């Protein structure tokens, strides 16, 4: 029993983290086989970052301008190129700790583990969701760019996020591992703002199922609702619309608990309209939306890697 915000074990990723310095700018890179991936703004200076022309900035560099350190070993750069907003630095030795891996791009609503790093060294690990507005509510300080987000399936690390920057509201923005930003953000220090966010409805329902599996049942009721009547309530409360595919994805948790999805939607309607009247669900006084249905099944069934 119990339900925690639980990250994947990070050892496979720790073995890939390196430090990349260009000039006085240092950040993290990801070393897979003989390539190091890192955010391209490592080539910027303090004066460069309002409106850098990255193509110009990169033409003026050569291999010897990139100092890559794996632990106490300096890795020799033998090639460099730009791919969208990341750099690919080809090095002369393949990482012997390279895991089986994939580069995947995730959807808003999906979760992943972040290995926060400074100067190439892991600092801590935590779980994040891709928000509907394509930001993530991370914990990142100066020097954390190049830290990656990932999921693990069996022995395979699926990298989905590389950290670049912090928006003025204190939320974070980054790219997939092909260098393409999540959302309408650019790697420049200008006024940028996230679009308005919304709550991830299918995830809130998944977490309510986790609560039932763990014995929190006070919010249940005998009511049902229709998918249309529910979605009218979701719109009013800034929740994402629930689809039939969401209802289907929640099928396994619905069968395990014996509570029909539209029955649980009736509970969520009442929680939205009346609050919790001083009670809590799984230790929270708020409706939690950064657990996917997969996360719930994974944790309440004990899947390992």
């Amino acid at each position: 029993s119990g339900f925690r915000k639980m990250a994947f074990p990070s050892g496979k990723v720790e073995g890939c983290m390196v430090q990349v310095t260009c000039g006085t700018t240092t950040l993290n890179g990801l070393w897979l086989d003989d390539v190091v991936y890192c955010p391209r703004h490592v080539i910027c200076t303090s004066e460069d970052m309002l409106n850098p022309n990255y193509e110009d900035l990169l033409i003026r560099k050569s291999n010897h301008n990139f100092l890559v350190q794996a632990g106490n070993v300096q890795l020799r750069v033998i090639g460099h190129s730009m791919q969208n907003c990341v750099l690919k630095l080809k090095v002369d030795t393949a990482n012997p700790k390279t895991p089986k891996y994939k580069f995947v791009r995730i959807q808003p609503g999906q979760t992943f583990s972040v290995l926060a790093c400074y100067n190439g060294s892991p600092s801590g690990v935590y779980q994040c969701a891709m928000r509907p507005n394509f930001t993530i509510k991370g914990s990142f300080l100066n020097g954390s760019a190049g830290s990656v987000g990932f999921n693990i399936d069996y022995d395979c690390v699926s990298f989905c996020y590389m950290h670049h920057m912090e928006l003025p509201t204190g939320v974070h923005a980054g790219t997939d591992l092909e260098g393409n930003f999540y959302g309408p953000f650019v790697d420049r220090q200008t006024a940028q703002a996230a679009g308005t966010d919304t709550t991830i409805t299918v995830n809130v329902l998944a977490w309510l199922y986790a609560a039932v599996i763990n014995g929190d049942r006070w919010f249940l009721n005998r009511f049902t609702t229709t998918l249309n009547d529910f979605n009218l309530v979701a719109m009013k409360y800034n929740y994402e619309p629930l689809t039939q595919d969401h209802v289907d994805i929640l099928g396994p948790l619905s069968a395990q608990t014996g509570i029909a999805v539209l029955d649980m939607c009736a509970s969520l309607k009442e929680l939205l309209q009346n609050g919790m009247n001083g009670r809590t669900i799984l230790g929270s006084a708020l409706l939690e939306d950064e657990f996917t249905p997969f996360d719930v099944v994974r944790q309440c069934s004990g899947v390992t890697f």
Partner: peptide, 8 residues
């Protein structure tokens, strides 16, 4: 306000 690129 502006965004902050988080290299160091």
């Amino acid at each position: 306000p502006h965004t902050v690129l988080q290299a160091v």
